[PDB]
Amino acid sequence: DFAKLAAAQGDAIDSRYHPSAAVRRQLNKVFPTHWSFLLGEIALYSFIILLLTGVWLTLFFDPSMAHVTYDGVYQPLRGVQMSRAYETALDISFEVRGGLFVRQVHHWAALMFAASIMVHLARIFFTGAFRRPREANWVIGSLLLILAMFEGFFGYSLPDDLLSGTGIRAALSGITMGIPVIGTWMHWALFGGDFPGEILIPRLYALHILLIPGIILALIGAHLALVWFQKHTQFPGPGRTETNVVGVRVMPVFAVKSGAFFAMITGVLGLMGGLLTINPIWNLGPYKPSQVSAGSQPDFYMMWTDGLIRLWPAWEFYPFGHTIPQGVWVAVGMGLVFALLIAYPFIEKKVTGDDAHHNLLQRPRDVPVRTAIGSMAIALYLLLTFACMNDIIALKFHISLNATTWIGRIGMVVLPAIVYFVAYRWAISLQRSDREVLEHGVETGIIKRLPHGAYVELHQPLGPVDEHGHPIPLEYAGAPLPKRMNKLGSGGAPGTGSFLFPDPAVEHEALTEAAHASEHKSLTALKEHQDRIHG
Amino acid sequence: DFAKLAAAQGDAIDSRYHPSAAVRRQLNKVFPTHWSFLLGEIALYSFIILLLTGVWLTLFFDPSMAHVTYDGVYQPLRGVQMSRAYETALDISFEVRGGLFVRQVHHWAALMFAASIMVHLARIFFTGAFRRPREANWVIGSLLLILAMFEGFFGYSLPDDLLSGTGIRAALSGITMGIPVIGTWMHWALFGGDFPGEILIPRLYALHILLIPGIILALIGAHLALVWFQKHTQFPGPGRTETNVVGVRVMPVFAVKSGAFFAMITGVLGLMGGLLTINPIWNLGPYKPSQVSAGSQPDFYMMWTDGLIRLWPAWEFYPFGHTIPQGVWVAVGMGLVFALLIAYPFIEKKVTGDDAHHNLLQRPRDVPVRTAIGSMAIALYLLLTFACMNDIIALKFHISLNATTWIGRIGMVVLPAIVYFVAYRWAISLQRSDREVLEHGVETGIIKRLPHGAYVELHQPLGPVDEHGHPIPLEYAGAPLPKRMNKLGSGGAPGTGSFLFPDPAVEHEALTEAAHASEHKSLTALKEHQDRIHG
Numbered sequence A, B: 001d002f003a004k005l006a007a008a009q010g011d012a013i014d015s016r017y018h019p020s021a022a023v024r025r026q027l028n029k030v031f032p033t034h035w036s037f038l039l040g041e042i043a044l045y046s047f048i049i050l051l052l053t054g055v056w057l058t059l060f061f062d063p064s065m066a067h068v069t070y071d072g073v074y075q076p077l078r079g080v081q082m083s084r085a086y087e088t089a090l091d092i093s094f095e096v097r098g099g100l101f102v103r104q105v106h107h108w109a110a111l112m113f114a115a116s117i118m119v120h121l122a123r124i125f126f127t128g129a130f131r132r133p134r135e136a137n138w139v140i141g142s143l144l145l146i147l148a149m150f151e152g153f154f155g156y157s158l159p160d161d162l163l164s165g166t167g168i169r170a171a172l173s174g175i176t177m178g179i180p181v182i183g184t185w186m187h188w189a190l191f192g193g194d195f196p197g198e199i200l201i202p203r204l205y206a207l208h209i210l211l212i213p214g215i216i217l218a219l220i221g222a223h224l225a226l227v228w229f230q231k232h233t234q235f236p237g238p239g240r241t242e243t244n245v246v247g248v249r250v251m252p253v254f255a256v257k258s259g260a261f262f263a264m265i266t267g268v269l270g271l272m273g274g275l276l277t278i279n280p281i282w283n284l285g286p287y288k289p290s291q292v293s294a295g296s297q298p299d300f301y302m303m304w305t306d307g308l309i310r311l312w313p314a315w316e317f318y319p320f321g322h323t324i325p326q327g328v329w330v331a332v333g334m335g336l337v338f339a340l341l342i343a344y345p346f347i348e349k350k351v352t353g354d355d356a357h358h359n360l361l362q363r364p365r366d367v368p369v370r371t372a373i374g375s376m377a378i379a380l381y382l383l384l385t386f387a388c389m390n391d392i393i394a395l396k397f398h399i400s401l402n403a404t405t406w407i408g409r410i411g412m413v414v415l416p417a418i419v420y421f422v423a424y425r426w427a428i429s430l431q432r433s434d435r436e437v438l439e440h441g442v443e444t445g446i447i448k449r450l451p452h453g454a455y456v457e458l459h460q461p462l463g464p465v466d467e468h469g470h471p472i473p474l475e476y477a478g479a480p481l482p483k484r485m486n487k488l489g490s491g492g493a494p495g496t497g498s499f500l501f502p503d504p505a506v507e508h509e510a511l512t513e514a515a516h517a518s519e520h521k522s523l524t525a526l527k528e529h530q531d532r533i534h535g
């Protein structure tokens, strides 16, 4: 008797505890159903996978630089001195069943975590979800993104590897040593000595499995709590206002689709972990200060750092008996970058002056200046990222390495300007397309007028029609407009039988007029709610 | 202008957010001011300290069994092969400023965590705090205690050491490989091979810095959430009923005193970490399977297990080609212990039949059977714990080791019975003391009656007095009774000047009158609240 058991357990829970009010309150919470709002979920989902994979990896990884001979299965590295960390990474790849798969999906999940964070940040930036109600969210999210990047760096740096080892040498050692006042001191504190210090990998392990994931989890808890209680923002629409959330309640619909999206994201990550090779460390011998590779890139989320190193023209300064290495520059760069990312909503509200409680999102086209700024930032990020890959780009695409370096050098100043101009004009053009469709209506096939040979596109008004042919123009309300009759109720009733065979005409009828009635009732209900809001 | 700044920040928070209702509700929550209710806080506080210390130790500890010669500062262990984990523990003790202090306070905080969990469990059990609402909090609390014991085990087992190494060898290896069906399989999965397997310490590190701490943190969060939202239970008293909480609000008083208690507990822990030496691993040579010492004990929270093994009469069984080693027994016994701990409240409500929603605690004396059971359990635990020390007890207190073993063996059945009988009769005698105080009143000095030589105690009634001398007997109400005229308004007006010099008689008179009136106002408020509640 499962129904009776469920009732009894509910009564026990509500008799010991009293969550009925609270449980109902969240089960009834409405979440907007825009696809873009799922972007952030991806990151969360990816994050979860990382945790689930990370713990597994912790059961088989020994962080240390204790030199050891492999003496393991992988023949091409036998008797070769390697840190215990590299030996255990090799053991996970080869010695433990599924270990290659587990660490592969872990690294793919790290990459997806980074990429989905970037996509979510772009979404919220261009849609203006960071305004008055939710700057703090932005801020923590920015911090969150930063942490992710660094943890990723500490992730592929954990298995002491030639690629990851040279990445540590460049970034941590060189840049930290370059910092003027305390740079050498910070370097000696982080490594407990010079670069090959014997307490680096254990410290990175502690930072990467315990500290940074814990901080990220706390910040994600804060993020999701704010989004939950600062109820999600929404795009402008028919019944959508600054004082309501139009969508689907949590329990019936939103929870099911969120869980299904987590399942499908996990499936994508598993398929990648199987079919795609990520960080094949065995090909990468154990780290040695002398051995090198030509590629020598970090994961894509630090490629912008590496490209900024490459493109910055070797500018150093030499004070009284002191050196300020060019590496210093990148540190300042990151500062500014982060200092501008974390603080952006406050600069936006200081310049624009928008200090109002904004709950309705803004289409990126409706904010040409911010859309242009974000496109410029994305262009600079892409330029830096590809500059980090200028070695490989030159190798595969035959372009001289100096030519690629100088293309990046001139680009980091020119390409942002061109992209800003183009994005500004593009946003204004999208606005004008919206205005044109409002004032004329959707476009269709051409007809030749009866008496003469006039050719007219035979538009479709979206609103009331004037006494004559042309309609009354509608007022833009910040919502997307249909540029294709395709997406209206035109030519959209295929036979509902099957792909191969039909269903009886009575069944097809029943179904099609039922769907027509349902969608008309949806439209009518939204319109009636809209009118009831004001009227 | 700190007032203006605070007002502006509050307005900004309440404009971006709307927590005024929630903030007020959590600021007004009432928590009873009984000392025993702070006991659990100790554990939480100590837990926090562990985290704060644990992180510090993760920046300096290298888990591994990579054999290395010390070649460090500690001369007595130089050129001796040992694990990198032991080398880094020694470096923390000697090579890191304050590292010895930090790890000593970490171990002392682990011991205080265990002891305070154990005392808090004693409080909850004897007071019936687990009885209906809060039965789950007992289960989740009992699972915190088990996790804490295992966490401490993996902690002092973490720095590969002679004492901790032999502890691992005994418990984790022998008991695990003694289990009939899967003992060897579990042993090989845990160690990745035979006992000294090269993956043990890194896996224990993963379990001890992240996994088990994470589970404990989540369970503690659930525990505190339940206590917070299942309003904390209270002892019976004047204005206290099943349907209220009498005490102090959170912010002005409870929060300040809780913070001060956290400060005082961390001060005690720091004082212990400095003045008291805990786990001098440098004296404990690096673990070698052929080496062992006489002591060979685990931390107190696990000693009972060892004690059990010492006192269990070497009973084995030999099925067809197989053997169940006597070690198995302790595991089974351990199971039983936890099996009887996690599932106690349900056994209590099955035997007594008492499933009512109890928000008022009950004094241990008021429940003689449960008090006797708890005393019996504590007696068995103490017997086992001291049996685990029978080596040291025999050494210092000259008793033949065989005599101590057999004393423990006979005791683990006799002493619980004697303690049960004594505690039952003691609880009933305490009840009778309370009943006679109610019937007759408090006791005082003796007087010889005027006409004859009668000597009378000169009692002092607590309630209405009958027409003649003797008072109407009061009915027990589940609250402590005053057994000393000490603790009433008797002989309690010392000089308020100072310890050395007086204050002017006017100031003393004003102060004492004000305190006297304040006590009347408090008692009167409680009395009117009582009368309004009942009538």
Ligand SMILES: CC(C)=CCC/C(C)=C/CC/C(C)=C/CC/C(C)=C/CC/C(C)=C/CC/C(C)=C/CC/C(C)=C/CC/C(C)=C/CC/C(C)=C/CC1=C(C)C(=O)c2ccccc2C1=O
Pocket (backbone or CB within 6 Å): A383, A386, A387, A389, A390, A392, A393, A396, A397, A399, A403, A404, A405, A407, A408, A409, A411
């Ligand atoms: C700092 C900086 C960016 C300097 C300049 C370097 C740079 C990016 C130069 C451009 C590279 C190109 C496009 C070379 C083709 C020749 C060329 C320049 C033609 C004129 C360009 C032009 C405007 C043409 C008009 C039409 C048009 C837009 C054509 C673009 C053609 C292309 C390549 C489109 C796709 C863009 C693309 C995927 C570029 C490569 C990006 C990267 C980093 C790929 C990395 C990558 C590599 C390197 C692998 O080897 C590989 C092997 C197996 C599986 C996967 C991969 C993989 O993903």
Ligand SMILES: CCCCCCCCCCCCCCCC(=O)O[C@H](COC(=O)CCCCCCC[C@@H](C)CCCCCCCCC)COP(=O)(O)O[C@H]1[C@H](O)[C@H](O)[C@H](O)[C@@H](O)[C@@H]1O
Pocket (backbone or CB within 6 Å): A382, A383, A386, A400, A401, A402, A403, A404, A406, A407, A408, A410, A411, A412, A414, A415
């Ligand atoms: C998203 C990325 C978009 C690109 C952004 C940046 C746009 C700004 C472009 C700036 C162009 C600057 C070109 C100058 C560069 C420079 O200064 O270097 C020269 C080499 O000139 C060249 O090649 C001309 C190259 C010009 C091509 C730029 C074309 C634009 C492409 C990249 C756009 C496609 C983007 C597609 C992106 C895909 C989508 C992204 C998501 C000489 O080098 P070198 O080789 O050493 O020659 C030695 C002598 O020196 C020496 O004397 C002589 O003696 C010899 O020894 C000789 O060897």
Ligand code: HEM
Pocket (backbone or CB within 6 Å): A047, A050, A051, A053, A054, A055, A056, A057, A058, A061, A089, A092, A103, A104, A106, A107, A110, A111, A113, A148, A151, A152, A154, A155, A156, A157, A158, A159, A208, A209, A210, A213, A216, A278, A279, B210
């Ligand atoms: C939270 C975001 C996280 C990110 C972005 C991240 C990223 C990464 C990446 C990219 C690697 C490289 C793996 C390889 O190349 O083989 C790695 C390694 C590793 N990660 Fe993380 N990780 C995260 C969380 C965690 C957590 C929570 C744990 C532990 C519970 C963990 C444990 C490990 C371990 C042990 C390794 C080394 C094992 C190996 O390389 O095979 N990670 N991490």
Ligand code: HEM
Pocket (backbone or CB within 6 Å): A210, B047, B050, B051, B053, B054, B055, B057, B058, B061, B088, B089, B092, B103, B104, B106, B107, B109, B110, B111, B113, B148, B151, B152, B154, B155, B156, B157, B158, B159, B208, B209, B210, B212, B213, B216, B278, B279
């Ligand atoms: C949650 C309850 C915890 C308990 C009961 C506990 C207990 C212990 C104990 C008794 C030791 C022995 C240390 C010694 O004798 O020198 C230890 C070692 C250690 N603990 Fe924990 N611990 C806890 C949590 C943590 C946490 C949260 C971390 C990290 C954030 C941590 C990190 C460490 C490290 C790295 C060591 C080895 C360092 C050394 O011994 O030199 N512990 N633990």
Ligand SMILES: CCc1nc2ccc(Cl)cn2c1C(=O)NCc1ccc(N2CCC(c3ccc(OC(F)(F)F)cc3)CC2)cc1
Pocket (backbone or CB within 6 Å): A153, A163, A164, A165, A166, A167, A168, A170, A171, A172, A175, A176, A179, A186, A296, A297, A298, A299, A302, A305, A306, A309, A331
């Ligand atoms: C260098 C580029 C690169 N080339 C290669 C080649 C091959 C491979 Cl495989 C990888 N790469 C990479 C690479 O991956 N780079 C990632 C990276 C870069 C810098 C930092 N930095 C943290 C802060 C430090 C800092 C700054 C300010 C401080 O002051 C404060 F904050 F106030 F305390 C303190 C510390 C500088 C180093 C991290 C990761």
Ligand SMILES: CCc1nc2ccc(Cl)cn2c1C(=O)NCc1ccc(N2CCC(c3ccc(OC(F)(F)F)cc3)CC2)cc1
Pocket (backbone or CB within 6 Å): B153, B163, B164, B165, B166, B167, B168, B170, B171, B172, B175, B176, B179, B296, B297, B298, B299, B302, B305, B306, B309, B331
């Ligand atoms: C042995 C005594 C001792 N002598 C010395 C001498 C010197 C020193 Cl320094 C310390 N000692 C100690 C010592 O500290 N003992 C602590 C101890 C005891 C047992 C276990 N066991 C948990 C369950 C495992 C188990 C069993 C069944 C399971 O089945 C399930 F639950 F269903 F999955 C799962 C796990 C076996 C090990 C741990 C620590």
